[PDB]
Tab-separated table of C-alpha atoms in Angstrom:
chain	number	residue	atom	x	y	z
A	1	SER	CA	251.712	218.504	174.922
A	2	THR	CA	253.484	215.188	175.466
A	3	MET	CA	250.600	213.676	177.396
A	4	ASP	CA	249.057	211.542	174.683
A	5	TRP	CA	252.421	209.987	173.909
A	6	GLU	CA	253.427	209.434	177.542
A	7	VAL	CA	250.091	207.659	178.158
A	8	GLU	CA	250.433	205.522	175.011
A	9	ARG	CA	254.078	204.679	175.769
A	10	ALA	CA	253.183	203.627	179.310
A	11	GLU	CA	250.460	201.284	178.073
A	12	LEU	CA	252.847	199.691	175.582
A	13	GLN	CA	255.552	199.300	178.231
A	14	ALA	CA	253.041	197.747	180.606
A	15	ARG	CA	251.987	195.162	177.992
A	16	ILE	CA	255.654	194.408	177.396
A	17	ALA	CA	256.196	194.059	181.166
A	18	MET	CA	253.337	191.571	181.442
A	19	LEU	CA	254.562	189.505	178.485
A	20	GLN	CA	258.147	189.531	179.812
A	21	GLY	CA	256.917	188.532	183.279
A	22	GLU	CA	254.994	185.605	181.794
A	23	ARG	CA	257.936	184.527	179.662
A	24	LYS	CA	260.331	184.698	182.632
A	25	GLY	CA	257.894	182.642	184.703
A	26	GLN	CA	257.606	180.053	181.933
A	27	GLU	CA	261.370	179.910	181.371
A	28	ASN	CA	262.040	179.342	185.048
A	29	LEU	CA	259.292	176.750	185.348
A	30	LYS	CA	260.649	174.958	182.263
A	31	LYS	CA	264.135	174.772	183.799
A	32	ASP	CA	262.735	173.356	187.057
A	33	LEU	CA	260.647	170.798	185.177
A	34	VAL	CA	263.746	169.598	183.310
A	35	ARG	CA	265.547	168.961	186.603
A	36	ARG	CA	262.530	167.092	187.917
A	37	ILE	CA	262.523	164.837	184.850
A	38	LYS	CA	266.237	164.114	185.220
A	39	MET	CA	265.742	163.140	188.886
A	40	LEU	CA	262.737	160.916	188.095
A	41	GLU	CA	264.816	159.179	185.418
A	42	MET	CA	267.489	158.504	188.053
A	43	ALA	CA	264.929	157.271	190.600
A	44	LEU	CA	263.335	154.995	187.976
A	45	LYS	CA	266.705	153.548	186.970
A	46	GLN	CA	267.723	152.971	190.591
A	47	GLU	CA	264.345	151.403	191.403
A	48	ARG	CA	264.734	149.052	188.440
A	49	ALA	CA	268.259	147.897	189.442
B	3	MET	CA	259.563	211.519	164.639
B	4	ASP	CA	261.319	210.194	167.740
B	5	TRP	CA	258.000	208.927	169.032
B	6	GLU	CA	257.199	207.161	165.744
B	7	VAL	CA	260.488	205.211	165.922
B	8	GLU	CA	260.105	204.156	169.564
B	9	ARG	CA	256.436	203.355	168.905
B	10	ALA	CA	257.382	201.021	166.073
B	11	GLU	CA	260.057	199.274	168.170
B	12	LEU	CA	257.766	198.764	171.207
B	13	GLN	CA	255.034	197.417	168.923
B	14	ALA	CA	257.406	194.985	167.187
B	15	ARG	CA	258.474	193.795	170.650
B	16	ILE	CA	254.906	193.083	171.806
B	17	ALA	CA	254.243	191.260	168.520
B	18	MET	CA	257.275	188.971	168.753
B	19	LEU	CA	256.574	188.215	172.443
B	20	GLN	CA	252.950	187.310	171.619
B	21	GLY	CA	254.055	184.945	168.848
B	22	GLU	CA	256.265	182.996	171.260
B	23	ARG	CA	253.630	182.212	173.884
B	24	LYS	CA	252.141	179.138	172.232
B	25	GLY	CA	255.596	177.582	171.834
B	26	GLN	CA	256.428	178.173	175.489
B	27	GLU	CA	253.091	176.648	176.434
B	28	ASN	CA	253.647	173.708	174.066
B	29	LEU	CA	256.996	172.955	175.703
B	30	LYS	CA	255.492	173.220	179.181
B	31	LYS	CA	252.823	170.675	178.133
B	32	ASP	CA	255.575	168.438	176.738
B	33	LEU	CA	257.519	168.444	179.994
B	34	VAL	CA	254.486	168.027	182.275
B	35	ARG	CA	253.404	164.980	180.237
B	36	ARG	CA	256.910	163.465	180.547
B	37	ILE	CA	256.740	163.893	184.328
B	38	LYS	CA	253.242	162.368	184.506
B	39	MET	CA	254.390	159.236	182.672
B	40	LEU	CA	257.630	158.989	184.626
B	41	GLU	CA	255.743	159.315	187.915
B	42	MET	CA	253.398	156.520	186.836
B	43	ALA	CA	256.383	154.429	185.797
B	44	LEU	CA	258.075	154.945	189.179
B	45	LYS	CA	254.925	154.201	191.198
B	46	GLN	CA	254.251	151.019	189.250
B	47	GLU	CA	257.842	149.867	189.687
B	48	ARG	CA	257.733	150.615	193.444
B	49	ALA	CA	254.424	148.715	193.779
């Protein structure tokens, strides 16, 4: 029957889903961190002037 | 056959995603360190 394959395929897809979820979380966090750095740079410059 | 092909493509996908984790985590560490030092710099200047 197709059961063994459906079970295997679901486990693979789940591992992919977890990896893709982690990556997406990291990508979004990275983009937010970049904005924070830019704004700190501007605050530092303004504070210095 | 059609399972063997999908199996191979799903497995390649997991492999390439696994190999990219350390680089993502390196970059995160990079950016968090930049923020830490900038926050110190700002505090010290405001003090």
